[PDB]
């Protein structure tokens, strides 16, 4: 299939500023009929995609003047002259030159604010869960910006990969930060084999990871 590649994955903007988003196709989108069937959609949470631009540079009915599109061959750009709050959402490029029609992975238009390191808290398995035979260790990484962040779990100082569930909030409406929950689920038996539990958060706000730990035997 034709691969549609969008950059960036996430674009932070301040209201009233200009925004440009890029889309590259793996194959030329010029049709035999001479058209270039490259389109742009906007999708807001809970709604379906809405068409914004079709055939590279045509604005769809009702789409405001601040949206424009350009490009040729394999490289396309969507431009917003001055970003309004209603423009926030996920933008998709799409091609219909070749069967099957395909879509890019999306570029999320988000809000810029000052950087902020996460507040990190770690929690041991509850006695209630241990009675059921399981042992979830939970790390909250709260109120950080920008969204990109990584968590590393260590058990007795050694990294662990199996059993991790990471879940992000959307951008907060009150302070424009993100938060995320990282859960390492073990069996009771595995938890009782080791004593030192650590989550390490790496974020652009520091080259040093944020390290939070507890010792099982003290809980």
């Amino acid at each position: 299939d034709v691969v549609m590649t969008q950059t960036p994955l996430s674009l932070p903007v301040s209201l009233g500023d200009q925004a440009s988003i890029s889309c590259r196709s793996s194959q030329s989108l010029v049709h035999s009929d001479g058209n270039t069937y490259l389109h742009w959609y906007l999708q807001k949470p809970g709604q379906s995609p809405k068409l914004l631009i079709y055939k590279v540079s045509n604005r769809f009915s009702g789409v405001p003047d601040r949206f424009s599109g350009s490009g040729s061959g394999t490289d396309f750009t969507l431009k917003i002259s001055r970003v309004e709050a209603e423009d926030l959402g996920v933008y998709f490029c799409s091609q219909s030159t070749h069967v099957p029609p395909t879509f890019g992975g999306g570029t999320k238009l988000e809000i810029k604010r000052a950087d902020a390191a996460p507040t990190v808290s770690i929690f041991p398995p509850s006695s209630e869960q241990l009675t059921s035979g399981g042992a979830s260790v939970v790390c909250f990484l709260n109120n950080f910006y920008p969204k990109d962040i990584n968590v590393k779990w260590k058990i007795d100082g050694s990294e662990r990969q199996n059993g991790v569930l990471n879940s992000w909030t959307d951008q907060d409406s009150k302070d424009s930060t993100y938060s995320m929950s990282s859960t390492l689920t073990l069996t009771k038996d595995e938890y009782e084999r080791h004593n030192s539990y650590t989550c390490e958060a790496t974020h652009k706000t520091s080259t040093s990871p944020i390290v939070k730990s507890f010792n099982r035997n003290e809980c």
């Binding site: 009929d33 069937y37 389109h39 379906s48 995609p49 809405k50 079709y54 769809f60 219909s96 029609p101």
Partner: peptide, 10 residues
């Protein structure tokens, strides 16, 4: 040619 999906349901 059917060339763009212009209207989508919810």
């Amino acid at each position: 040619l059917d060339y763009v999906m212009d209207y989508w349901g919810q």
